[PDB]
Point group: C2
Chain length 68, copies 2
């Protein structure tokens, strides 16, 4: 989900950006407030939700591996 998840433009939904090219070069180069807030939030929300459920399950398990 981290390496292949992408984020699509709201006004042109056919151009979707992966994180490592395109979305990292927005946050490292842009000086526009609205373009930086878009990337952030978007990527955030999406990957967020995903890693969420999985993360919870993972936390629950990795504790059983450590307590044993």
């Amino acid at each position: 989900i981290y390496s292949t998840g992408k984020v699509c433009n709201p006004d042109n939904p056919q151009e979707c950006l992966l994180l490592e090219p395109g979305l990292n070069e927005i946050m490292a180069n842009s000086l526009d407030y609205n373009e930086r807030l878009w990337a952030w939030e978007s990527w955030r929300s999406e990957v967020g939700k995903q890693l969420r459920p999985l993360y919870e399950e993972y936390v629950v398990l990795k504790n059983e591996m450590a307590r044993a």
Copy 2:
């Protein structure tokens, strides 16, 4: 929008299908009712909305070209 618009799976949103490979081979080969209803509706809705506004504008214009 027609040639580059894609449709993503609901349970795995990282696999997205274009129309000409993948989405045409669902409707031509599958015998599953729920997989055929998914493709249809999805593609439909998306391309639908897009071509919608543009289509209206286009209809409005092409009439001025024909009346002149």
